[PDB]
Structures are given as C-alpha cells and as structure tokens.
Amino acid sequence: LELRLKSPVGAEPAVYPWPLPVYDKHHDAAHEIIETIRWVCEEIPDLKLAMENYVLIDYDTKSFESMQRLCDKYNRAIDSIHQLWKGNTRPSTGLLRHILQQVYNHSVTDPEKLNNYEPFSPEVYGETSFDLVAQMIDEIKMTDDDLFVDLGSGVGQVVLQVAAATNCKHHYGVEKADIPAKYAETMDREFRKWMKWYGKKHAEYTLERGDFLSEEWRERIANTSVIFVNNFAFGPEVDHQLKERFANMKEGGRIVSSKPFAPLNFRINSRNLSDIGTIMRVVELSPLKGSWTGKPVSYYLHTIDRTILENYFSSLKNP
Ligand SMILES: COc1ccnc2ccc(N(C)c3c(Cl)cccc3Cl)cc12
C-alpha cells in the first residue's frame, strides 16, 4: 500500500505510504502530490502535452485507486517524455516555496516539540518569512565572494532558501537548541534529496549545532561577509556580546536583522564613541517602500563602515 512519483530527471522515485500522512487540519501529502505534479508540468511543457487533461481535475484524495491512477497517469507521461528526449538550474521562486514546504512536512513530523509560539515559528515559514527572505535576497545581491551565516538558524529554512537562490561560496546555519538542531539534520537530507528529484541546483551549505557566542564562532563571525540574525527576542547580554562579535567584521560586512543594532539616526559625538553606531551604517528596508500586498513588515541592513569613526577624528583635527 504505497504511491510512487517518478523524478523528471531520473533520480530515485518519491515513495509515499498509504494511508497518506496528514501534516495539519487542512494540509496533507495528497495535496503535496498534486502540487508536485503541477509544478513538474509547469516547468516541462512536453509533460503538460503528454499528460491526459482530466487527471488533475477529477481526483479523490481519500481514494487509494484514484490517487494511484493520478500518480500512474503522471508516471506514464514522464516515461513518454524520457522516450522523446532519448530520440541543473536554480528553482523558480514558486517552485522553491513548494520545495521548502515539502522538505519541512517530511522533516518536522511533531511541530509541538519545537515549543515556539512566536510569529517567527518554523511552522509558519511559508506565510511571510519566505516572501521577506526572497525580498532580502533581491536587495543584498550576494556573489561567489560572499559567505552567508544565519545566527540561530532554527531548522535551517533561511539557509536552505538563500542557498537555493544565491551563488555565495558557502551558507552556514548555526543553532544552539537541541530540538531544532536535530530537525535541521533531517531538513538537510530531505532538501538535498528533493532538489535532486526536481533536478535543481543549490549552493554549498552547512547546518550545524553550536553556540554563535563561543570562542570558535568569534573568528567565524569576523570572516563572514553577510550575517542574517533574527534578534527580536534577544536579551541585553546576547545583544551586547553580538555587537562585540560584529566589531571585528571587515569593511563592507553586512548584517540583516529584525531589530536594528544601532539607532537609524545615530550621530557620533564625544559621549557615544563606544557605541556600535560609530562603525556601521543602518538602513530600514521595507517591501512596502521597495508590488507588495503582504504584512507591513521591515528588516534592517547594517554595513560595517569605519569611516564614520575616521571622519569624526578628522573633523576634530581639521575644523
Ligand atoms: C513572520 O515574519 C516576520 C514578521 C515581522 N517582522 C519580520 C521581520 C523580519 C523577517 N525576516 C524573514 C527576516 C529578515 Cl528578511 C531579515 C532579518 C531577520 C528576519 Cl526575522 C520576518 C518578519
């Protein structure tokens, strides 16, 4: 009692047991199967031609025979296409959203175990987070010279999105908490598997368990060109310690966060020379300022710039 979907690129088939798993009250593997077939048909026009027109309209998700017929119709169409071609790019944003949801659904089987009541829960990543990360990727424009680090990466969703979208040398996710770090290990395996199934390319990435405030992570942060950090719930000790880590970054180093690390209107004077604002520019980025119909949300871009401090010293010596 199982359903199989052949890979469009000839990777191992996707195998689902019957009864099909339920993800939540309105989401299940039956809808994941249908949407997977629709995405494959969308980015292979010959498949849309080969597949019989009625198959994706008349289905019963609660009938094994109906779900098996649908799966077999898609599989036969994949075979006809593999016969035609007989005689890896980055995923589109739409496909990437589907891949990340699918990776989460196969990985995080018990979402209760996360103990996350915040609007930044991994359970609701596809809601606003995905769109805001997509907006962030278009705004910061990373290259092969960049190293991306998500400090407090949860189950690794931001890392997986950024690695699928950009050409950074490497993407890192560091998570301290045991439950999301263990789930991140499954997210990693499922992501690599599904990306191979779709025939999609991603950059190199590593999801690791660790404390980003440790001695080891001090030099690592200093050598990072792009830091992503959801610092919304951080206490003053973690905030203070992080600012010390950032103070060792290179000129042009960037930090993307949910709360600014320095005031947006920082003005250097003799009484605030210790403040992180003396060595970084800070800008508020908002998709409502940047065709956005989502949440009225903002994020913050910090850029290491020691000329802020230099100009202050030059202005004292050269009035
Ligand atoms: C449900 O999502 C959100 C709700 C409210 N505000 C938000 C602020 C930022 C954000 N993201 C994805 C993010 C970015 Cl793009 C850069 C750095 C840090 C973060 Cl957490 C998500 C938000």
Swiss-Prot record:
Binding of S-adenosyl-L-methionine occurs at 125-128, 148-157, 175, 211-212
How the protein is affected by changing residue 299 to A? Loss of activity
Q: What is the effect of changing residue 230 to A/D?
A: Loss of activity
Q: Please tell me, according to the UniProt entry, what happens when changing residue 89 to M.
A: Found in a patient with developmental delay and intellectual disability; likely pathogenic
Give residue numbers for the modification (Phosphoserine): 286
Identify the residues that the record assigns to the DOT1 domain, covering every copy: 12-317
Q: Where in the cell is it found?
A: Nucleus
Q: Return the similarity comment.
A: Belongs to the class I-like SAM-binding methyltransferase superfamily. DOT1 family.
The protein's job, in short, is: Histone methyltransferase. Methylates 'Lys-79' of histone H3. Nucleosomes are preferred as substrate compared to free histones. Binds to DNA.
* Subunit structure as annotated in this protein's UniProt entry: Interacts with MLLT10.
Q: What else is known?
A: In contrast to other lysine histone methyltransferases, it does not contain a SET domain, suggesting the existence of another mechanism for methylation of lysine residues of histones.
Q: Which disease is it linked to?
A: Defects in DOTL1 are associated with an autosomal dominant form of global developmental delay and intellectual disability, with or without one or more major congenital anomalies. The patient phenotypes are characterized by central nervous system (CNS) dysfunction, such as mild motor delay and significant speech and language delay, and a range of congenital anomalies, including brain structural anomalies, cardiac defects, varied urogenital features and growth restriction. Variants may cause a gain-of-function effect leading to an increase in cellular H3K79 methylation levels.
Protein name in the entry: Histone-lysine N-methyltransferase, H3 lysine-79 specific
Which source organism? Answer: Homo sapiens (Human)
Span of the full-length protein shown? 5 to 332 of 1537
